[PDB]
Ligand binder design. Sequence first.
Ligand SMILES: CN(c1ccc(Cl)cc1)c1cc[n+](Cc2ccc(-c3ccc(C[n+]4ccc(N(C)c5ccc(Cl)cc5)c5ccccc54)cc3)cc2)c2ccccc12
Ligand SMILES: CN(c1ccc(Cl)cc1)c1cc[n+](Cc2ccc(-c3ccc(C[n+]4ccc(N(C)c5ccc(Cl)cc5)c5ccccc54)cc3)cc2)c2ccccc12
Lengths: 352, 353
Amino acid sequence: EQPEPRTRRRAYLWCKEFLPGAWRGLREDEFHISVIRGGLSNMLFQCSLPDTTATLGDEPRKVLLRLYGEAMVLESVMFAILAERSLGPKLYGIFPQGRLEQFIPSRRLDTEELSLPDISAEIAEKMATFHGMKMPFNKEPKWLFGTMEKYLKEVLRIKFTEESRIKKLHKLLSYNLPLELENLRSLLESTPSPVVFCHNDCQEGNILLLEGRENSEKQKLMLIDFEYSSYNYRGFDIGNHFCEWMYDYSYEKYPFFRANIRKYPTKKQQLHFISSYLPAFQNDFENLSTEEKSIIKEEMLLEVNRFALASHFLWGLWSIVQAKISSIEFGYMDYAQARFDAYFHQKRKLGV
Amino acid sequence: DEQPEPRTRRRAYLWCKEFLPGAWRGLREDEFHISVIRGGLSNMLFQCSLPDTTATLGDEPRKVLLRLYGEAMVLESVMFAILAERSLGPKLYGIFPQGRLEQFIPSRRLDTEELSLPDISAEIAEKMATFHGMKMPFNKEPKWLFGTMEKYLKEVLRIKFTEESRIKKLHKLLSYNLPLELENLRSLLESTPSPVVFCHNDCQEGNILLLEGRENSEKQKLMLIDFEYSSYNYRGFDIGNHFCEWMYDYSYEKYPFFRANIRKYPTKKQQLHFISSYLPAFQNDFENLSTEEKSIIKEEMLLEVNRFALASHFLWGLWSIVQAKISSIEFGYMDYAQARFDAYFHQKRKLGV
Ligand SMILES: CN(c1ccc(Cl)cc1)c1cc[n+](Cc2ccc(-c3ccc(C[n+]4ccc(N(C)c5ccc(Cl)cc5)c5ccccc54)cc3)cc2)c2ccccc12
Ligand SMILES: CN(c1ccc(Cl)cc1)c1cc[n+](Cc2ccc(-c3ccc(C[n+]4ccc(N(C)c5ccc(Cl)cc5)c5ccccc54)cc3)cc2)c2ccccc12
């Protein structure tokens, strides 16, 4: 797929002006560009040198161009920090209309792969590593309930025009969400979880399987797409990831997802995950007694399964608001209903 | 121990409490120590610290610097962060809309007279060289120099002062036909090769820290700071501008709040000492070239930096005229403009251009 000749021009100039080596002397007629994702918000292109052109130093042959649609400053700083620490794609250029990033040959994981033991173990290690790092952002964990409050308030003010959405919203408001948010607050306020640097969206579509490295046991993945990252309760990040075993966003018919409550990880599979996470997050952990390890692990199961409720609640509210304001083709209200179904199922499973 | 207003004191307390880890997280407003370093109307600095009696819980700092602020805002933050990660600037502890929290570095600024000490001059060159060699995610077309001179020239032509002395001083400055002089400087510089590199663009004594404790180190006692004017730019501008700064001392206490001295510009000898440290630190093979090839590079570099020095005078001269209209800061801006243009014409005569 080719873009319009006007974006093609703009892109040529960005690469020419921002990238060093052979790129600096490159002519419009030798510029290769093609699409990866299009639309109206976060559009991706692969830009490259022609195969016949030689590099002059260590510049990339090929790069990723990301066109964009307080928060703008924070996301850029963080993208740069991760790039410097080699935990994210390198940052090659930053401008108002977009940015230029390392191109990493890879594919996203499919939902079904999240439960493969070796995949699950590595995701845990990465998340653990990510949780341990220092970032220059606010460390009060106010984003979880602050955000749930903000969306709840919008949700109560929403008037849809189409009858089917009006009906679906009416079924959702029937649960008395402001009362349910307070119950979830008191449950989570009594559930200790250390505040750490969370990804907050650790789903299959934000996990890259790296080309070439498929045979590596423990080093085949990269976490990406940190736009929702913040300091937050650890339980949310793990609980949210566990929830993601149940949703597959690649389904081609409406509503463009498939949900399965029986795909939530078993106790066994949860233990496999936290057995990799704990040593990578608390370095002394491997040298505790058998019995002390079991205690930590059992309290962690309770922790993450409780915070899983906040994953369902938050993304459910989010999705209702998106049904009003997003143009993207997705059955947002059906998804909201699926998250609230799972919420009430998980409440029953926990006895809370 | 000079204290800020109780409202800034409270804001600052919250920022430190919320952004810094360890003992800071549990700290009470009444246990917060803060004092001023710089005040005014724009970029205000405070030293914030834990009380001496409080213990740290890990590797958090006891003491930090709070910087209150007055496209460019995104790029400056990214760059401050990049330099922090590479240990070429103060560590970044917190970033918020009203300011940021940075490593506090016990130090003083250099004085103008210290720029010419051989060991100081040599290290400045090494640091600038290191700085020039870095990859940064910014535009690499060197359009900021003339783009900026054009932009200020255009403002300068539209300025009406009301007070007589400023009117007179502006009139003397416009007498030189600045739009014609800018074109002559363009054609001179278009014929002067200079590699485009990552420039500080303001490498003056007040942006160079002498690090406390390290005074006895020969080659590692300084840090370059304050990169808000940084960009990809001609290498000649950075070196030429630093050479120009040997002539200006901004610490004079009476109006016009600077002193200028044309005879303090570095000698050819002192310039060679500077570029003799810069070259090996920027091109690592440099020491193993032939004697004759080294001399050629060095002599062309002298011509390069002394020619770009003209752009230092021209740019800061125009900048200063514009500041005389819009800055509230106490400084003889028009006198400074005249001093930079005097130096410009003197440097033109020295070069035979
Ligand atoms: C201006 N500019 C730019 C200008 C000049 C130059 Cl030289 C370069 C760049 C630009 C830089 C970067 N971008 C990329 C970008 C992508 C996403 C966002 C984004 C969106 C909304 C929000 C708030 N928020 C909502 C929901 C949460 N959700 C859903 C949420 C999820 C989980 C939890 Cl626990 C809590 C909340 C949540 C979460 C955490 C933090 C914030 C959150 C934050 C960030 C922001 C920027 C640009 C994009 C478009 C246009 C310009 C851009
Ligand atoms: C929004 N926000 C913020 C928002 C959200 C969060 Cl979470 C955190 C922060 C903020 C971030 C950072 N700051 C600090 C800051 C202040 C000014 C600037 C700056 C601006 C405009 C300009 C133009 N320029 C002039 C002259 C040159 N001069 C004189 C010049 C010198 C030499 C040469 Cl060769 C050419 C020109 C030159 C040079 C290069 C580039 C630009 C130049 C320069 C600097 C850079 C950062 C904020 C300040 C106030 C309010 C908000 C701020």
